[PDB]
Structures are given as C-alpha cells and as structure tokens.
Design a protein around this ligand. Structure first.
Ligand SMILES: CC(=O)N[C@H]1[C@@H](O[C@H](C)[C@H](N)C(=O)O)O[C@H](CO)[C@H](O)[C@@H]1O[C@@H]1O[C@H](CO)[C@H](O)[C@H](O)[C@H]1O
Ligand SMILES: [Ca+2]
Length: 142
C-alpha cells in the first residue's frame, strides 16, 4: 500500500508559543500547530509553513488535517511549493482548502522529488482576519 514519508523538521513564519510547526507532525490529531494569536497586523498573512524530510524523496500526495474542533486557522487559499534540496523552492499548485472543517487531500499530477514542502497560506478561517492552524500534515508515496 501507500507509504507515509517521515517529516524530521519544519519551520513556521508565525507561531504561538507552544504551538510551533512540529506540533503538526507529532502523530497527534489533537495537538496543533497554530499561528500567533496576535493576528491584527496588515501583513500578518501570508503565513509560510515548511516541512522537511531527511532526504529527497518521491511523494505522490499530501493530506492537510485541520483542527477537529474550533474554527480558528482552517486553511483557505494556499500556494503549495516544494524543494528538491531544501533551499530552492518551486511552485506546485494553488490549493483552496475552503476553510473546510475536514481533511483536505491534494493528489499530485505526477510523482514529485522533494526534500521539503512549503505552504504559503494566503488566508485561513477564524476570528478577525483569521489564523493558520494544523492538527497534522501528512505526505505519502503510492
Ligand atoms: C474554546 C473557545 O471557543 N475559545 C474562544 C473564546 O475564548 C473565550 C474568550 C474563553 N477563553 C473561552 O470561552 O474558552 O472566544 C475567543 C474570542 O474572543 C476565541 O475565539 C477563543 O478561541 C480560541 O482562540 C485562540 C486564538 O485567539 C486559539 O485559536 C484557540 O485555539 C481557540 O480555542
Ligand atoms: Ca499534531
């Protein structure tokens, strides 16, 4: 069957203390990555999230898992990027997660060779202008 790719590290351009990026790859669907609660700035969005593998890897699809209760931070419009070496990034696709309360699967047209994936989150649901949050982010090869 399908094989889950191991995320070894990541970064977030915005995070609330204790809700940094690595909380969205701890295998726990209740723990959250969550952007900073100070979401008033005009340049608060976009919020840029990066997930790293140990080495360049074949990847066929991903699944974004939003928080399964509460509405703050469910992804809306995003740009998905990836990098073969972890340094230079390439646009994959624009993906609108629609502020959905359930998981969003993105299936790539062809297998990608990526050491890193990157999400430019343009918008997300929630109070005020919104937030960005994620219970778990997953990557798979077929
Ligand atoms: C559980 C809940 O709905 N909390 C929201 C609520 O918080 C009030 C003030 C209080 N702490 C409580 O009822 O528990 O109302 C505020 C808006 O004032 C906010 O929506 C609370 O949600 C939380 O918002 C923060 C960011 O400000 C995070 O997104 C938390 O995950 C979220 O629960
Ligand atoms: Ca988690």
């Amino acid at each position: 069957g399908d094989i889950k790719i191991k995320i070894v590290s990541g970064t977030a351009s915005s995070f609330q203390s204790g809700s940094n990026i690595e909380k969205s790859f701890d295998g726990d669907y209740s723990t959250l990555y969550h952007s900073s609660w100070s979401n008033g700035a005009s340049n608060y969005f976009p919020i840029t999230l990066t997930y790293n593998f140990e080495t360049v890897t074949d990847v066929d699809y991903l699944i974004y898992h939003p928080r399964n209760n509460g509405n703050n931070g469910r992804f809306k419009e995003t740009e998905i990027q990836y990098s073969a070496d972890g340094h230079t990034f390439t646009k994959l696709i624009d993906k609108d997660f629609q502020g959905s309360a359930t998981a969003g699967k993105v299936t790539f047209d062809q297998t990608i060779q990526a050491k890193s994936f990157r999400f430019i989150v343009k918008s997300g649901s929630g109070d005020g202008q919104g937030f960005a949050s994620c219970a778990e982010m997953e990557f798979f090869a077929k």
